[PDB]
Design a protein around this ligand. Structure first.
Ligand SMILES: CCCCCCCCCC
Ligand SMILES: CCCCCCCCCC
Ligand SMILES: CCCCCCCCCC
Ligand SMILES: CCCCCCCC
Ligand SMILES: CCCCCCCC
Ligand SMILES: CCCCCC
Ligand SMILES: CCCCCC
Ligand SMILES: CCCCCC
Ligand SMILES: CCCCCC
Ligand SMILES: CCCCCC
Ligand SMILES: CCCCCC
Ligand SMILES: CCCCCC
Ligand SMILES: CCCCCC
Ligand SMILES: CCCCCC
Ligand SMILES: CCCCCC
Lengths: 254, 256, 262, 263, 255, 255, 264
């Protein structure tokens, strides 16, 4: 009879194998964490070391009860592949997560645009990243999607550039317009003077002459510099009698 | 002759194998559920443990009736692959379902936007999620599709931000306009005063000066704060003689 | 080789055995694969799922049979697997789309996101479901067109169901001249929706100034009715708004423009 | 090796046997694969399905034949599988699109979402179906263009069929000036569609104020007719709406604008 | 020592195999071309018959110098796969080329639209098709791309259909307008009279009443029938005092 | 002990194999280049012949130190596959490069449009093609991308066709307009007279009658013929009192 | 306790298995560094030499594990299967990065752009800062930092604004329908003749280009050095304005002929 002996041996092997798997796979895990390898990378790789051993164990254990060696590979292969398909997206997001943490194209707290979606990063989870839009919406984007696309970071550079486009009537003095605009941006102290300070006639529009003005400020200042400068342009041009034209039209009666 | 003995043995093995499969695969299932592993994950994995054993059983059983060991693998392989292709989408939705339950980017009852489709979540089924739009339509979105895309959640933050853009005639007093607007948002108690309260000249438009106003309120209040504040802006500006301009045009006459 | 006929009829026996095996195998395949099919159908498993799975049980046995049968005429065991493998794969590619539609068909039947007779929108295509066939779903548009959409395509996308909820919501946006009394406009609109008995009064009844438009003030009105009523409530309420505002001297403004002569 | 000719003609026998096997195999392939083909066609299985499946039965046998034939000249059994495998795979890739179109062709014939002669819209392309070939479908547009669409592309997408239903629905949207009598407008329109005998009276006959437009009030009119009638019912009804409204002094407004002068 | 004998045998086998490959693969090629099988199909399939034999030869030849039988399959497999990837697009274009030749959805000289690109087909090469646009641009489209998409053929039907849409002022006589238009298309002999001849009030536009006119002519005539008919519509309506309205607008003053 | 002998033999085999690989793979390379096979094709294929031999060498060499024959295949397989994935895009661009050189849908110096990007081709590198836009931008497009899409060639045909669309007021004499336009294109010698010379009333527009004019010139002339002809149309119509209408509108007053 | 002949008997294969792993790991280190130095010294790219050396390393660890696990009875096909799966798992996870890695090499190797050049990579323009292992960083004209994956970059078009030393401005000027075509051209030609930053040995187009709805449109095309392009446009444009105003050439507003009626 002595089938009983193989059946208990098969269980013994499974038990001994499961235990020797736990320890070898923790040993390797501590070893990589202590060598400053990423926690998730060390985790993922240790999990493989674990199941590699369970696999070898099942092969030997099922082997002793006559289950053939190719059959175990085939079956486990299928199982692995089934799990593989189910875990596929997550595995990809997992990896992206590691790379975002590892290379930090953005950091929690930075305003970014990830595929036409902008807001301030809260956190980068294992599989996805959370951000808060300027108006309090919480957006959750999968890590894989993020890393496949462009990452625009508004916060990384300390200094940024406003552009104004102002339209004035076709009969404005080009010199006066420029002078006034230049005075405005000269007197604004939040405008960096050691950088570009463009003030030019840019376009001959349908109903107006368009002047471009480009001026750098610190990120923090950018918003208010625009608003403040714009209000001055309004008041100054009104004072100087420079017209902001409405839509124009020549009409020919019959 | 004694082929009969292999044929009965083959059946015996199938029967004994099917029974020993049931129990080993339930044992492992209860073990996972009791260790607080997800019900669907524990189910999926147990189903594999089950068929792994049926596979080993069929190999040994068909083996004893002379069907070769590689033939059984090939055939079962093909079958598995056939089923694999058919079950592929669902398997992916199944997994997404687990992750939505597990990480709860949204919860039943939250207003969300899943790929340009907005409404309040009813439930997250095994393969798909159901929501009701603001006007009573029921939308059913596959879980996989949801988790591949962005998940905008309107309900998660307690505090949210209205923006108003008001256009006034080019001859309005910038100071007056701002003052009035500021008085309106100061006197509204549903507007959080410890947060942003922006009131600025924002744009020199074709026919109007455009002021932006940005003010935070609780999610619940957001809708009505907008409506209420807007109606006041109208009445106040009308009282103060601030003009909401119609489209403008300078026309220069001639005769042919 | 006239005289060398001991090893001749010797082959004949394998050739007949090979046929015998094919025949016996084909018969034992039919029965085992029907037995399994009845077993599933009787255990309340879907007819198509039970069919699909039984078909596999069938060909698995024909495969084993061909291997053994071709085997006894010397065709090697790996060759039969390779060849059948290729054949299977060829059929596999040809049947791929259908297999996917087949599965979607099962799931639409099984979970019924929609039911025959419901107005639905499947990927920007709306109409009333007629049936869900094995591979595709048929619907009739509001104007009598028959659209046939593959099941797989349906289940991959969103399914908007107009019919599932018993109660639905109309939105009206009405534009009135900038000199209208905000209070009067609201009052009139509120009277209209109060007096409409098909408008559910225990639900939202919004009437608000919504937008300061280029040429008009825009009021939003939002009011729930039963699905069946929704269409006619809109039409009826809209006609009243027209007649009432006209009576009250509330102007629906045309496009506006201030023109400055030069 | 002049004298060493015992082992020479010894190879000749395998070489002729190899050819004999190829020949016998090719012949036994032809017949077995025709036998199966007639069997399917006679059992009312599709001609193309029966063809495709028979072609596999054929080459399966040629494959077994080549293995045994090349085998008897020492070419090893795994080598033949590998080589034929590659060849098969090469052909596989080249034939892939067609194989998919072939299958779609079968399904279009088999389920007939459309039939030759029906006006259909296949992925934003409309016209009257001429035929469904093995790999693609041909249609003629309303203005005489011939479009050829691959079968696979057709079956992956929506199939809108204009011809399947016998009865279809016109919608008219008519804009009248803001000072029109809502009752009069409706009455006139209703009279027009009542007196049109090609408009089915047992079905919807909607005539409603639908939209308050920028320059006009818009009335919707919806009325069912037989497919054949649909075109002319629209034209005929529209012309009447014009003449009737003109007679009744109901104005079709031009674009409107209030203009406020200054200097 | 006698390794030298295996090494020469290995070369002998390679040489004998290469020669027996050439002939068997030409024999098969002539057999197919003579049985009216496509030149490219017969070529492609013969090339496989060739390398199948070189493969068997290398296996046996490398075998007699001790290189194991699975190793040769693995290595050649890899090589084949490397070439496979590089040749993948072309193989697909090759096949499309065959099918375009074989089924001729279009023929050289026909005006066609292949995926929103129109012009007159010059030729269908092995991998791609060349056409000349109406204004002398040469477009080269890959065969695979062509066969995956729609093929609109303007030249296949002998008879085609013009549509005119004419806008007239809201005060035009519907009967007069129709009559005039009908007279114009009746008197045009290049307009097929046994086919559709639609002349109807089609649309109540913002500034005009729009009449549709639909009339069939031969492909060759279509262009000039349109131009000629259009000029007559202009002259006739002007003569009859039917107005082609400019953009309209009702303006309501104040100040 | 005599493990040392296998270890040195293993190295000997690697060395002998590497050397016999170099020569066999150069021999094949010269053979192809001398038979007028493309330099890149001959290169790619020779590289395979090389590594095939290194593979056989490693199998035999690692074999003699006890590393099993299936293990070497598996490992090298994986390595090959790793390199395969990394080299995949380039391999595809490589092949496209060959085909663009080989079939020359365009040639350096031709103005072409490759997927909505136009300019003059500078060169076709191994993996990508460089062009200069009309305004001095250098665009670099991967070869694979190019060959997958349409290739519009402006330079290939020697003769090309201008189309002018001119709008004149609704009260213009159709005959006069045509006559003037015809005189203009008759007197232009850079307009080929043995080809199409269309001058027709084409469209009844909202504010104007639109005449189409279509006339062929040599590629080189096309640009300036358009400019020159257009300026004449302006001066001639002004002289003849033919009006280029501004936007039109009928306005109906109320109070 | 007594059955200890076959007990310590296993211990030897277990220590041998470890010995093999250790000896294999060490002989892997050196062989894979030896190959790495060999490539780097032969002027092979640092990343290519790295990637290939890493394969040489693990190939040896693989052979080592097979032999080591082999001596403790773990069968030779099992080790291949298991390592295969592991490799494949890692393969999938590393797939995107592997593709970006390769693109990184090719961008460095062929330099379609160089740090400091203004480029447009898939409708995104700015000046390149650096090309990292997996991605490229650029700064937009207004101070935004964009990070684009290398693979995405090489799959698409690369427009380089900085590579050519000479570039071409186009001006389109609209003048009233009653302007003298000759005068307009003459003035424009004088402007571009007198601008010294405009290359005179190259195209200098000034033509009537379009008969627009409300204006005649003249095109002007003129080459300058990359550095000059911006300011040449601005300067030339301002002159066109002042000159035309002086010469009484009108920049027309939108035009319309209006035909009055009196409804009743
Ligand atoms: C290889 C994993 C150890 C951490 C690497 C950190 C790299 C920083 C790149 C900026
Ligand atoms: C394989 C033969 C079965 C034919 C199916 C017919 C279906 C008819 C539906 C209209
Ligand atoms: C129109 C179909 C022609 C088919 C010819 C097949 C030859 C191979
Ligand atoms: C095997 C049949 C299960 C059906 C699921 C029902 C869910 C609504
Ligand atoms: C393997 C290094 C080659 C580098 C070639 C450089 C081409 C510009
Ligand atoms: C599929 C779920 C995996 C989660 C690991 C934390
Ligand atoms: C880690 C769990 C694997 C199966 C998920 C469905
Ligand atoms: C739960 C049913 C099994 C899947 C076969 C389609
Ligand atoms: C074919 C889908 C199977 C259903 C499992 C719940
Ligand atoms: C039922 C027919 C099988 C499909 C082969 C194309
Ligand atoms: C008809 C045989 C297939 C040929 C592929 C190019
Ligand atoms: C690629 C050619 C296939 C033709 C089958 C009729
Ligand atoms: C037929 C040539 C082989 C392809 C290598 C680019
Ligand atoms: C990539 C080379 C293929 C060329 C065939 C003529
Ligand atoms: C020639 C280098 C091989 C590819 C590794 C990135």
């Amino acid at each position: 009879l002595s089938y009983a002996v193989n059946i208990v041996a098969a269980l013994a092997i499974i038990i001994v194998g499961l235990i020797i798997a736990r320890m070898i796979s923790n040993a390797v895990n501590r070893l990589m964490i202590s060598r400053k390898i990423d926690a998730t990378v060390a985790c993922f790789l240790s999990a493989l070391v674990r199941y590699g051993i369970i696999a070898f164990t099942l092969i030997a254990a099922l082997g002793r009860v006559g289950v053939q060696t190719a059959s175990v590979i085939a079956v486990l292969g299928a199982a692995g592949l089934a799990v593989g398909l189910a875990l596929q997206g997550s595995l990809s997001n997992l990896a992206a997560g590691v790379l975002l943490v590892m290379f930090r194209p953005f950091r929690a707290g930075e305003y970014v645009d990830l595929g036409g979606v902008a807001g301030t990063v809260l956190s980068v989870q294992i599989f996805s990243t959370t951000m808060r839009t300027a108006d309090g919406k919480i957006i959750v984007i999968p890590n894989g999607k993020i890393i496949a696309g462009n990452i625009i970071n508004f916060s990384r550079e300390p200094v940024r550039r406003n552009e104004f486009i102002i339209g004035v009537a076709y009969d404005s003095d080009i010199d006066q317009v420029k002078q006034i605009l230049t005075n405005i941006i000269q007197s604004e102290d939040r405008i960096l003077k050691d950088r570009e300070m463009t003030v030019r006639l840019n376009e001959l529009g349908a109903s107006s002459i368009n002047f471009v003005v480009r001026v750098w400020s610190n990120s923090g200042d950018l918003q208010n510099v625009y608003w403040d400068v714009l209000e001055r342009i309004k008041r100054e041009f009104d004072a100087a009698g420079i017209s902001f034209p409405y839509p124009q039209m020549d009409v020919n009666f019959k």
